[PDB]
C-alpha positions as a Markdown table, in Angstrom:
| # | Residue | x | y | z |
|---|---|---|---|---|
| 1 | Unk | 140.1 | -259.2 | -141.7 |
| 2 | Unk | 138.3 | -262.1 | -139.4 |
| 3 | Unk | 135.9 | -262.2 | -141.7 |
| 4 | Unk | 134.6 | -265.4 | -143.2 |
| 5 | Unk | 134.0 | -269.2 | -143.2 |
| 6 | Unk | 136.0 | -271.4 | -141.7 |
| 7 | Unk | 136.2 | -274.8 | -140.2 |
| 8 | Unk | 138.4 | -277.1 | -137.5 |
| 9 | Unk | 140.5 | -279.6 | -139.8 |
| 10 | Unk | 142.9 | -280.2 | -137.4 |
| 11 | Unk | 145.0 | -279.7 | -134.2 |
| 12 | Unk | 148.0 | -279.8 | -132.1 |
| 13 | Unk | 147.4 | -280.1 | -127.8 |
| 14 | Unk | 144.2 | -279.6 | -127.6 |
| 15 | Unk | 143.8 | -283.4 | -126.0 |
| 16 | Unk | 146.1 | -282.1 | -123.1 |
| 17 | Unk | 144.7 | -278.4 | -123.1 |
| 18 | Unk | 141.1 | -279.8 | -122.7 |
| 19 | Unk | 142.5 | -282.3 | -119.5 |
| 20 | Unk | 143.5 | -279.2 | -118.2 |
| 21 | Unk | 140.5 | -276.8 | -118.7 |
| 22 | Unk | 138.4 | -280.3 | -117.6 |
| 23 | Unk | 135.9 | -281.2 | -120.3 |
| 24 | Unk | 133.8 | -284.2 | -120.7 |
| 25 | Unk | 135.7 | -287.0 | -122.4 |
| 26 | Unk | 133.1 | -287.4 | -125.0 |
| 27 | Unk | 133.2 | -283.9 | -125.8 |
| 28 | Unk | 136.6 | -283.8 | -125.9 |
| 29 | Unk | 136.4 | -286.9 | -128.8 |
| 30 | Unk | 134.4 | -284.5 | -130.5 |
| 31 | Unk | 135.8 | -281.5 | -131.6 |
| 32 | Unk | 138.9 | -283.2 | -132.3 |
| 33 | Unk | 137.1 | -285.9 | -134.7 |
| 34 | Unk | 134.6 | -283.5 | -135.7 |
| 35 | Unk | 134.6 | -280.2 | -138.0 |
| 36 | Unk | 133.1 | -277.7 | -135.8 |
| 37 | Unk | 132.3 | -274.8 | -138.0 |
| 38 | Unk | 133.3 | -271.4 | -137.1 |
| 39 | Unk | 132.4 | -268.1 | -138.7 |
| 40 | Unk | 133.6 | -264.6 | -138.4 |
| 41 | Unk | 132.6 | -261.2 | -138.9 |
| 42 | Unk | 134.8 | -258.4 | -137.7 |
| 43 | Unk | 132.2 | -255.5 | -137.7 |
| 44 | Unk | 134.7 | -252.6 | -136.9 |
| 45 | Unk | 135.8 | -252.6 | -133.0 |
| 46 | Unk | 132.9 | -254.9 | -132.4 |
| 47 | Unk | 133.3 | -258.5 | -134.0 |
| 48 | Unk | 130.3 | -261.0 | -134.3 |
| 49 | Unk | 132.6 | -264.8 | -134.1 |
| 50 | Unk | 130.4 | -267.7 | -134.2 |
| 51 | Unk | 131.6 | -271.4 | -133.6 |
| 52 | Unk | 128.6 | -273.4 | -135.6 |
| 53 | Unk | 128.2 | -277.3 | -134.6 |
| 54 | Unk | 127.9 | -277.9 | -138.8 |
| 55 | Unk | 124.6 | -276.6 | -137.9 |
| 56 | Unk | 123.1 | -278.1 | -135.4 |
| 57 | Unk | 123.8 | -276.5 | -131.9 |
| 58 | Unk | 125.4 | -273.3 | -132.5 |
| 59 | Unk | 127.6 | -271.3 | -129.8 |
| 60 | Unk | 128.6 | -267.9 | -130.5 |
| 61 | Unk | 131.8 | -265.5 | -129.0 |
| 62 | Unk | 130.4 | -261.9 | -130.1 |
| 63 | Unk | 132.8 | -259.4 | -128.4 |
| 64 | Unk | 134.3 | -255.7 | -128.1 |
| 65 | Unk | 138.0 | -255.2 | -128.3 |
| 66 | Unk | 139.9 | -252.6 | -126.6 |
| 67 | Unk | 136.4 | -252.8 | -124.2 |
| 68 | Unk | 135.8 | -256.4 | -122.8 |
| 69 | Unk | 132.4 | -258.6 | -123.5 |
| 70 | Unk | 130.9 | -261.9 | -121.6 |
| 71 | Unk | 132.2 | -264.7 | -124.0 |
| 72 | Unk | 130.9 | -268.5 | -124.3 |
| 73 | Unk | 134.6 | -270.1 | -124.3 |
| 74 | Unk | 135.2 | -273.5 | -124.8 |
| 75 | Unk | 135.7 | -274.2 | -120.8 |
| 76 | Unk | 132.9 | -275.1 | -118.5 |
| 77 | Unk | 131.2 | -271.9 | -118.7 |
| 78 | Unk | 130.8 | -268.0 | -120.0 |
| 79 | Unk | 133.3 | -266.1 | -118.7 |
| 80 | Unk | 133.8 | -261.9 | -119.4 |
| 81 | Unk | 137.3 | -261.0 | -121.2 |
| 82 | Unk | 139.2 | -258.2 | -122.5 |
| 83 | Unk | 139.7 | -259.0 | -126.4 |
| 84 | Unk | 142.5 | -256.8 | -128.0 |
| 85 | Unk | 144.1 | -256.1 | -131.7 |
| 86 | Unk | 147.3 | -255.7 | -132.6 |
| 87 | Unk | 147.4 | -255.4 | -136.4 |
| 88 | Unk | 147.0 | -258.5 | -138.1 |
| 89 | Unk | 146.1 | -260.2 | -135.4 |
| 90 | Unk | 143.7 | -261.1 | -132.4 |
| 91 | Unk | 144.3 | -261.0 | -128.3 |
| 92 | Unk | 142.0 | -262.0 | -125.7 |
| 93 | Unk | 142.8 | -262.9 | -121.8 |
| 94 | Unk | 140.0 | -264.6 | -119.7 |
| 95 | Unk | 140.2 | -265.2 | -115.7 |
| 96 | Unk | 140.8 | -269.1 | -116.5 |
| 97 | Unk | 142.6 | -269.4 | -119.9 |
| 98 | Unk | 144.4 | -267.1 | -122.7 |
| 99 | Unk | 144.3 | -266.9 | -126.3 |
| 100 | Unk | 145.2 | -265.1 | -129.6 |
| 101 | Unk | 143.7 | -265.2 | -132.7 |
| 102 | Unk | 145.4 | -265.0 | -136.3 |
| 103 | Unk | 144.0 | -264.7 | -139.5 |
| 104 | Unk | 146.7 | -265.5 | -142.5 |
| 105 | Unk | 144.9 | -264.3 | -146.0 |
| 106 | Unk | 142.3 | -267.2 | -146.1 |
| 107 | Unk | 142.6 | -269.2 | -143.0 |
| 108 | Unk | 142.1 | -268.7 | -139.7 |
| 109 | Unk | 144.4 | -270.0 | -137.0 |
| 110 | Unk | 144.0 | -270.1 | -133.1 |
| 111 | Unk | 146.1 | -270.5 | -130.4 |
| 112 | Unk | 145.2 | -271.2 | -127.0 |
| 113 | Unk | 146.9 | -271.3 | -123.9 |
| 114 | Unk | 146.5 | -272.2 | -119.8 |
| 115 | Unk | 149.5 | -273.6 | -117.8 |
| 116 | Unk | 152.6 | -274.7 | -119.6 |
| 117 | Unk | 150.4 | -275.8 | -122.3 |
| 118 | Unk | 149.2 | -274.3 | -125.6 |
| 119 | Unk | 146.4 | -275.8 | -128.3 |
| 120 | Unk | 147.0 | -274.8 | -131.7 |
| 121 | Unk | 144.7 | -275.2 | -134.6 |
| 122 | Unk | 144.2 | -274.3 | -138.4 |
| 123 | Unk | 140.4 | -273.8 | -139.2 |
| 124 | Unk | 141.1 | -272.9 | -143.0 |
| 125 | Unk | 138.9 | -270.9 | -144.9 |
| 126 | Unk | 136.5 | -273.0 | -147.1 |
| 127 | Unk | 133.2 | -274.8 | -146.1 |
């Protein structure tokens, strides 16, 4: 489905995965001590993903799968990357890191990747 409100309740290897990307220490501590809210609307091959900071800033990741698009990402800057799908899951690969999302009924989880490190998360489906 990939459609609904979600929010990051917890993380697994976020700290190190960040230390590889190279994020600022305060911003590192925020996401892990903060519920980044996450909405999604899989409107067909195009998606309207979003990553709200609880109403204030809103970063967004609109993209089209089997096509590619510019995506804002949690790295230093925007990149362009080929999002793809499989069946009950989602796929992407940027010239920077790799990531695959995977809905579970009423829960969004994601698993990022880059160099011997991988950051799982569990954006639950609630508010």
